[PDB]
Design a protein around this ligand. Structure first.
Ligand SMILES: [Mg+2]
Ligand SMILES: [Mg+2]
Ligand SMILES: [Mg+2]
Lengths: 219, 123, 222, 226, 195, 233, 196, 204, 196, 195
């Protein structure tokens, strides 16, 4: 298609230490790899993160707009907007446009003291869902977390980051359209913290050597 | 056609009569020879002209099969002529149209040999 | 029925240096198997040390560039002649593109310039205004022929230190404007050989703190 | 593809460009489109490249067997009748568009044949994506009683029109001249107007640049004795 | 596709709703509550097109809550069902029709009678002792047609519903990931603790 | 969205040392029917511009009226309407290009390919193309429809690049145009023998030639062509 | 394409334009559409060039084998062979053929074979895309037992109009005259027939 | 849906000084899903090397078919088939399925045992021969390979230099194709020794 | 439908057939297709009967309001009003109209408006399904400055051939003569024009 | 759609196959065995178009059993997998192609090595340590890519498979009604008693 679309590798999960957000950085037009360095996490504001799945433009434009609407709310009400309220601004907007051809599957992630760590999955269909974990792998959204479904609520921030990084690596290897690098975010009550850009090429060899996993692959 | 059966069969002595009699026909045929040199081969025969009014140039006993392969015979001329036609065609259908080159001498010989073997066993 | 879109061919290349940027495009304009022009410029100085190209359907490309140039003029009027930064230009072009989200500008847009720290900047846009800041972006017909080459010769991807057996990556060095232009010229020379829509001429706009300058090189006319 | 035939005083000249394209990509920059049906009967092909080669080699093979059978040099009207009856049978599904030119005991001949099995006679013909560019030059400069030198010049000029103005054509000009009572002369790369310029840089890598996991000797030799 | 069943017993109405949200071969949620409280003694369950179901359900909730405040009165389930039907009936000849199927379970405090209303996406309304929307409809109807008694107690009605869900789990190709059960009686609306 | 009904074929043009030449045949075709022969498709605007139009003739007659209205409008409260504030080719083109792109952007195009030939105030040659898609481009030679395929190759042999323009006289340019019109008559089924030719020169101004005919045609060789292959009679 | 065959006192004349098109492109501007299937039996071809060439070639073969065994075939026999091929293969053929011949017994005869592969014997026949424009003219101007010169003028004037109005017709006007005297080929160039 | 891009993968062949090189990726997929990283696309019949891209079932079938035909050839001819002759056999074999073709992009590489002349050829799915002097490309990243080869390639490269060129051409082309990669093999072919090298590359 | 308008010495004559069809059924065999939009400005209608009747009615209204304010309109003005309606509503109209009028200043004028809504001023115009068959005849037989009797004969002979060959044309030949002398209606019955 | 997983451990091959047969929204069986024993040390599991799967599987079984009797020999899994691939490869350009996907698990008594072959409906064959056909493929691959060790015991391989099935039950929209597990080792083919 003309419009860059992302059907794969966005993960967001809730844990003791807040929310982990993990994405890949690959953009594909058909089988052509357009880029290995795209940002699939949209920084709406210092406390709100959005994941880009579906139309790249549709996600960028309307989640940048959501940050504008969130800023207005804070000027008018002199209070941080709740994740419930921020998610519902975007969900109600895409519902107006329903049937026009907007494509968006996004996890709105925020940590407020009213709600605690909150993830909302927002759809171009007008679906708005609160959940502990959401993942998007090759145009398919799942609420289970790529690897073991259980994982841990009582998980260290270091360990939770690794699980998210390792989860993107699992998808990046198997999924043709997933790859490039992993971008890691830790969402706390005081805001989100960037946990860097990790090349999947270098990550894969290191993980394989240290975990002993990917025995099937020769390196 | 009701001759679906072999006309060449083993006699009690283990002879194939029709092959022996074919070889007898070849014996009565005009002499032809071949000599192989280091840098070429020669094939030769006598143009036994049936009549002096006949233009013996119009009867080719020595035939090009491929640009690099020639054939001469002893025995029944008409049998030779149709074998040259089949040999020329099989060089194309079973080789040149597959490999894009003319067959080696031994393999074109192998194909001609096969056609003559079939006239020895076919109905 | 009436098809409001067409393909005018062409290929464009944006590379961002440490303290410079280049936006290059071939000067050939085509429809189907015919050449319309051997010299129809595709890369434009828009003012404020910003160069722009909108490659694909030339009509939509001309319209977008025209609208953006006008946007710069009105930015000056509305904001006391404030210089439009490349990041602000990029966000502005997203809104121009996304405005026609349900009847898009059938173009791949690249802008080149310097950021507010004086460092080389290239921004790449999809037809509906999705955008990213990049060091290297080829757009148009021969993009798939050029980008793998740039991955290898700019970022030194799949290149390692001899005698380390792939344990040490070839270290990234800052490329001079002269080396970047060699890579641009070789990219288009190679594309011209293998892509029927690429040829005739190569126009390169180079952006530095000193301003915008223009270099032109002939390409094969077959 | 740009293909032309030009009849002249004592023969016919056939010419073609040397670019082969998969969609917008140039697969071969020095492709030979001038094909032999028989030693003094040549043709140029446009459309499906496999089909034009396949149909020439098949009719070329059958023409050779016919020539051997009849003890006569092959005729262009035989190559033509055999090509058109084959293409007609396949109702355009064999995408072969050919300009057939040659000399035989009957004289010099120039024909065009289309994929559906229709044929045409002419003193000048053009075929392929570059035919309109080529035909513009032929319609401008063609006259009756052309010399060999004039016909080669006109033919190669008509191909050049295709190379420069058609994206489907490019690179070089191939020519074949078939003159009565003479050997056909095939002039491969008669013109070379599109030689690539020297690159700005050598892309020869230092040895050991590529990361290697495993090396092994491949056994291409047969099973050994002893 | 989704499961929404309603049974009206002697003194209450029970609504059982599938907890699964699936888009294509993707399971988005396994704890989804396909219910909105319209008024203290009226409950609406909904199944249908994604987005439209929640948007419609929440719009109805707001309008009924608005009427409650303005008149300081609770609309009868009959009145709420008539309002909900009319809103669905508007949608069918609209530009983009709502694809939402609902069950309305309410207790009428004036008549001291439980009432169950089945309304499809076209605004087709019927008052039934038991109702269902989707593939599960035909199976449960035949089972309920046999077992259902109008003098059934809430516990008897719960047992019968539990049988339905057990039989539906066996016979259905899709996994609907269990049901939430809610009882609507004179005391209000409560979620059944264990099912 | 519509479909063209009555249509005009190729418009061809090129730059020479001192100005521009543009030409078009006088035919309005109704599908395969060559219905109207007295159709003028070169429309002069003042003494410095000629607009050559191919495609839908109803849309051409509309464009003709827009240009006629443009001249009227420019003269309103304009004491220099016949001097410094006269319509330039560049003004007339940019207007048409604006209209063409707007009409395609409302999915209701003017079903035409337009070449604007003229000479600017400073004596610069103007030659630019616009079509029903709002696509625009400039070249030392321009042609629409069949002209693009057959005329351009011939005209580009005279002016292949910008540096050839000063070396091209009006006699050589006109000759090349007239030859290209003969080639189009030979090979274009929707063409006509009768054509108009306009020269806009920076010295001698606008010369408009009507009722020109394709002449010096080669047909004699037809008598020798018999059958489609084997036929000898 | 504009083709016609006209019977006159001394025989029949076949007329045709010389134009073959692919869409609006003139693939051949000097086409010969008057095709010999026997010494004094010719046909005018319209439709698929591949189809009419294939049919004419098969007919020529059939009449050559006919002549070997039974001597010179009648024009009616030639028309019958054309019809058999056209009618039986109507699903896979796009061919409109006029068959014209001279016998000594029957003299000049014209048979037209439309798309369905029906046969119609006529004093004269017009066919091809350009024929639509001259139905009026031909019906008003055709007389029986015209001279050779009158019939040449009638065909020249007729095809002149067909060419003028039809984009698919054009080039030279080819004619073949079939009489006891033999077979005569006529060609008329644009400068001659355009000024009529 | 498009048979030639279901499984993915690439082959490139290059000529050097008294040598040829042929290289392929190791990926086999079902569209987005990677299935195997051990799917070699280069086979050899004596000293003649055949790479095949496209529909994987046809790759396997054509390998089995050319092994069959080159085995019979050898028994009858009493010698190994040469690259020039094999190229014609591949062409013939593909064109016989003209209206039901194998969905493949075959590449022939080898040195003529008698003349010592390096030889490469490519084919479309119905057997049209591309006999390039320089390089041949095939598969889902053919555009990327054309780009890489056209800039990286220079004539008369020594075997160990040609190895670097073809390796860098394959690796960087594959990394710009979703359906190519998951490992790579390079054959450096000389008149009477062939070296096979597995390359280290990114596994995404 | 076969319609034509022909300018002569004393003015212009409009000719039309009288046939309206639904498929092969003749819905009306005595249709009047010569329609008055002003005293000496008439039109010939071809295409959608609903469309040409609606357009003619609107034009008649426009010229009646024109006449009230500015006096008698020119034939050119009438053609212009027709064109405006046809061109601006080209997407939703199927109408081919010939406009014929007599001024004292301009005399006899003929304007044809094809489907696109383009305007062409001509010495004479032919239109309708039956016009295709008489392009040859009309182009050969039309002279400028013919007498009234010659022009009636020209139109009668022309539409006679159009009717003969076109199934969509037939019935009577209606004509309207526009001169300084006034407006004259002529009718010609099958028994008259079939024997021509 | 259906679930067929194979894992090749140190000394055996394990095949887990979904027990459910569904046509549309109808569940036809919940105890279906999608396996045929081709030879004593070779097992084939199959999923795909209804009728074709069993017809293909049984046809292969007959042909391999025929070869067994004629030569009084058991074909190697490699040989059986090559035969099965060729039969599938014939079908694709046939009048009505078989839509059947298979896993071939065999123990090679000559090499004393377990082997697993994955062949799709087109005759696309690969030898893998683990394989799967259908929607379940991508999920199980990522899990097996992490956990799988080539020196794994049969009990370790069984545990890993059990994890896969548990995770598949949670994440899949359809109910595949459990799996049958069969082990292929040197002693032959046995059905795992409890899973
Ligand atoms: Mg090029
Ligand atoms: Mg004409
Ligand atoms: Mg990849």
């Amino acid at each position: 298609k003309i419009k860059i679309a992302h059907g794969t590798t966005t993960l967001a999960f809730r844990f003791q230490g807040g929310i982990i957000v993990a994405v890949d950085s690959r953009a594909t037009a058909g089988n052509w790899v357009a880029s290995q360095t795209v940002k699939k996490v949209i920084e709406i504001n210092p406390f709100l993160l959005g994941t880009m799945a579906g139309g790249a433009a549709d996600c960028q434009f309307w989640e940048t707009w959501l940050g504008s609407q969130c800023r207005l709310h804070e000027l008018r009400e002199k209070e941080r907007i709740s994740v419930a309220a921020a998610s519902k601004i975007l969900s109600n907007l895409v519902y107006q446009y329903k049937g026009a051809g907007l494509s968006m599957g996004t996890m709105i992630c925020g940590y407020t003291r009213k709600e605690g760590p909150t993830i909302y999955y927002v759809d171009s269909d007008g679906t708005r869902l609160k959940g502990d974990i959401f993942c998007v792998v090759s145009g398919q959204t799942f609420a289970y977390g790529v690897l073991d479904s259980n994982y841990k609520w009582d998980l260290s921030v270091e360990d939770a980051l690794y699980l998210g990084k390792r989860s993107i690596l699992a998808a990046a290897h198997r999924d043709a359209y997933s790859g490039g690098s992993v971008n890691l975010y830790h969402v706390t009550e005081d805001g989100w913290i960037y946990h860097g850009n990790h090349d999947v090429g270098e990550l894969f060899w290191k993980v394989k050597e240290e975990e002993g996993s990917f025995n099937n692959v020769i390196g | 056609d009701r001759y679906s059966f072999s006309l060449t069969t083993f006699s009690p002595s283990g002879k194939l009569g029709q092959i022996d009699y074919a070889l007898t026909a070849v014996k009565q045929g005009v002499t032809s020879l071949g000599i192989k040199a280091t840098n070429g081969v020669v094939i030769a025969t006598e143009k036994k002209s049936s009549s002096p009014l006949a233009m013996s140039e119009t009867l080719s006993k020595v035939s090009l099969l491929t640009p690099d392969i020639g054939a001469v015979y002893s025995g029944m001329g008409p049998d030779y002529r149709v074998l040259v036609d089949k040999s020329r065609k099989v060089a194309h259908t079973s080789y040149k149209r597959i490999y894009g080159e003319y067959p080696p001498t031994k393999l074109l010989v192998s194909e001609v040999a096969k056609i003559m073997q079939e006239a020895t066993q076919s109905g | 029925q009436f098809n409001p879109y067409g393909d005018n061919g062409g290929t464009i290349l944006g590379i961002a240096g440490e303290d410079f940027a280049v936006l290059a495009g071939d000067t050939r304009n085509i429809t189907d198997y015919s050449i319309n022009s051997r010299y129809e410029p595709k890369v434009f100085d828009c003012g404020d040390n910003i160069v722009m190209s909108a490659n694909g359907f030339a009509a939509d490309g001309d319209a977008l560039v025209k609208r953006f140039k006008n946007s710069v003029k009105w930015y000056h009027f509305d904001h006391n002649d404030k210089k439009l930064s490349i990041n602000s230009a990029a966000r502005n072009i997203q809104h121009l593109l996304y405005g026609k989200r349900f009847f898009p500008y059938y173009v791949h847009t690249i802008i080149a310039g310097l950021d507010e720290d004086g460092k080389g900047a290239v921004y790449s846009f999809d037809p509906v205004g999705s955008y990213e800041r990049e060091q290297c972006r080829a757009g148009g017909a021969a993009a798939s022929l050029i980008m793998p080459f740039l991955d290898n010769q700019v970022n030194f991807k799949n290149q390692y230190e001899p005698g380390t057996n792939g344990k040490v990556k070839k270290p990234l060095k800052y490329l001079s404007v002269e080396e970047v232009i060699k890579l641009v010229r070789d990219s288009f020379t190679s594309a011209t050989e293998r892509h029927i829509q690429v040829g005739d001429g190569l126009e390169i706009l180079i952006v530095t703190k000193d301003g915008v300058r223009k270099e032109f090189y002939e390409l094969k006319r077959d | 593809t740009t293909i032309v035939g030009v009849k002249f005083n004592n023969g016919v000249v056939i010419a073609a460009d040397t670019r082969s394209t998969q969609g917008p990509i140039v697969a071969d920059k020095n492709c030979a489109k001038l094909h032999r049906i028989s030693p003094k009967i040549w043709c140029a092909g446009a459309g499906t490249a496999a089909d034009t080669e396949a149909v020439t080699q098949l009719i070329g093979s059958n023409i050779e067997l016919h020539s051997l059978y009849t003890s006569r040099e092959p005729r262009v009207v035989s190559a033509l009748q055999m090509l058109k009856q084959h293409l007609f049978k396949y109702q355009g599904h064999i995408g072969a568009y050919l300009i057939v030119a040659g000399v035989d005991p009957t004289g010099s001949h120039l024909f065009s044949i289309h994929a559906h099995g229709s044929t045409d006679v002419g003193y000048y013909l053009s075929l392929g994506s570059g035919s309109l560019a080529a035909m513009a030059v032929l319609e401008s400069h063609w006259k009756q009683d052309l010399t060999k030198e004039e016909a080669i010049k006109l033919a190669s000029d008509a191909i050049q029109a295709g190379i420069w103005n058609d994206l489907g054509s490019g690179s070089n000009v191939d020519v074949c001249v078939m003159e009565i009572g003479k050997d056909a002369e095939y002039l491969r790369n008669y013109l070379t107007p599109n030689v690539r310029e020297e690159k700005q840089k050598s892309y020869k890598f230092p040895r050991g640049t590529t990361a290697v996991l495993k090396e092994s000797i491949v056994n291409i030799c047969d099973i050994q004795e002893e | 596709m989704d499961i929404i069943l309603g049974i009206r017993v002697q003194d209450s109405v029970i609504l059982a709703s599938s907890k699964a949200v699936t888009r294509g071969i993707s399971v988005l949620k396994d704890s989804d509550d396909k219910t909105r409280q319209l008024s203290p003694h009226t409950l609406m369950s909904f199944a249908g097109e994604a987005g439209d179901t929640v948007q419609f359900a929440e719009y109805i909730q707001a309008n009924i809550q608005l009427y409650s405040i303005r008149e300081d009165y609770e609309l009868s389930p009959q009145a709420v069902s008539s309002f909900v039907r009319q809103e669905l009936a508007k949608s069918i000849r609209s530009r983009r029709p709502y694809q939402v199927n609902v069950l309305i379970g309410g207790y009428d405090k004036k008549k001291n009678k439980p009432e169950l209303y089945q309304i499809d996406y076209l605004g087709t309304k019927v008052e039934l002792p038991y109702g269902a929307h989707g593939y599960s409809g035909f199976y449960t109807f035949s089972l309920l047609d046999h077992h259902y008694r109008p003098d059934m107690t809430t516990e008897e009605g719960l047992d019968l519903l539990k049988l339905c869900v057990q039989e539906l789990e066996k016979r259905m190709p899709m996994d609907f990931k269990g049901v939430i059960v809610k009882i609507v009686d004179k005391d209000g609306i409560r979620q059944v603790d264990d099912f | 969205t519509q479909q063209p009904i009555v249509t005009g074929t190729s418009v061809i043009s090129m730059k020479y040392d001192n100005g521009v030449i543009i030409a078009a045949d006088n035919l309005g075709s109704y599908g395969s029917l060559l219905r109207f022969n007295g159709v003028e498709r070169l429309i002069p605007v003042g003494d410095n511009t000629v607009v050559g139009i191919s495609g839908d003739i109803s849309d051409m007659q509309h464009i003709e009226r827009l240009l006629k209205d443009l001249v009227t409008e420019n003269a309103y409260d304009n004491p220099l309407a016949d001097a410094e504030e006269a319509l330039e080719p560049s003004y007339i083109f940019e207007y048409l290009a604006t209209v063409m792109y707007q009409r395609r952007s409302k999915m209701n195009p003017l079903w035409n390919a337009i070449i604007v030939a003229g000479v600017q105030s400073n004596g610069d040659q103007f030659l630019r193309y616009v079509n029903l898609l709002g696509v625009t481009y400039s070249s030392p030679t321009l042609a629409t429809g069949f002209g693009a395929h057959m005329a351009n190759p011939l005209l580009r042999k005279v002016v292949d690049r910008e540096s050839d323009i000063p070396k091209t006289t009006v006699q050589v340019a006109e000759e090349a145009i007239v030859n290209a019109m003969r080639v189009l008559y030979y090979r274009d089924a929707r063409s006509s023998r009768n054509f108009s030719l306009a020269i806009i020169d920076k010295n001698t101004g606008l010369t408009f030639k009507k009722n020109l005919q394709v002449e010096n045609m080669k047909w004699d060789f037809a008598k020798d062509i018999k059958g489609y292959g084997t036929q000898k009679i | 394409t504009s083709i016609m065959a006209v019977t006159f006192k001394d025989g029949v004349i076949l007329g045709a334009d010389s134009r073959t098109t692919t869409g609006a492109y003139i693939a051949n501007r000097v086409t010969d559409k008057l095709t010999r299937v026997h010494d004094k039996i010719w046909c005018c071809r319209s439709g698929s060039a591949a189809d009419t060439q294939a049919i004419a070639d098969i007919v020529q073969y059939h009449l050559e084998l006919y002549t070997s065994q039974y001597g010179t075939p009648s024009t009616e026999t030639a028309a019958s062979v054309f019809k058999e091929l056209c009618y039986e293969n109507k699903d896979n053929l796009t061919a409109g053929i006029i068959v014209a011949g001279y016998d000594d017994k029957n003299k000049g005869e014209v048979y037209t074979i439309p798309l369905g592969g029906s046969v119609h014997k006529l004093p004269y026949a017009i066919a091809g895309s350009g024929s639509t424009f001259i139905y009026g003219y031909c019906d008003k101007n055709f007389r029986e037992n015209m001279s050779k010169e009158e019939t040449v003028d009638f065909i020249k004037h007729s095809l002149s109009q067909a060419i003028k109005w039809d984009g698919s017709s054009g080039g030279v006007i080819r004619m073949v005259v079939l009489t006891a005297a033999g077979v005569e080929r006529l060609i008329f160039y644009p400068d001659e027939y355009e000024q009529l | 849906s498009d048979p030639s891009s279901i499984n993915g993968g690439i082959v490139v062949a290059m000529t050097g000084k008294d040598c040829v090189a042929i290289a392929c990726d190791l990926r086999l997929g079902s569209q987005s899903l990677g299935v195997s990283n051990k799917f070699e696309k280069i086979f050899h019949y004596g000293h003649v090397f055949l790479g095949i891209t496209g529909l994987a079932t046809d790759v396997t079938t054509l390998n089995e078919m050319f092994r069959y035909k080159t085995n019979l050839y050898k028994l009858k001819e009493e010698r190994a088939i040469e690259p020039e002759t094999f190229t014609q056999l591949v062409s013939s074999s593909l064109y016989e399925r003209r209206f039901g073709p194998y969905f493949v992009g075959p590449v022939v590489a080898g040195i003529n045992s008698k003349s010592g002349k390096p030889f490469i050829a490519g084919f479309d799915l119905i057997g049209c021969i591309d006999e390039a002097k320089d390089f041949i490309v095939s598969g889902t990243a053919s555009d990327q390979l054309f780009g890489m080869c056209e800039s990286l390639y220079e004539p008369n490269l020594e075997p160990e230099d040609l190895f670097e060129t073809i390796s860098q051409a394959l690796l960087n082309a594959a990394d710009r194709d979703a359906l190519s990669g998951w490992g790579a093999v390079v054959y450096i072919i000389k008149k009477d020794e062939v070296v096979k090298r597995y390359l280290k590359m990114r596994q995404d």
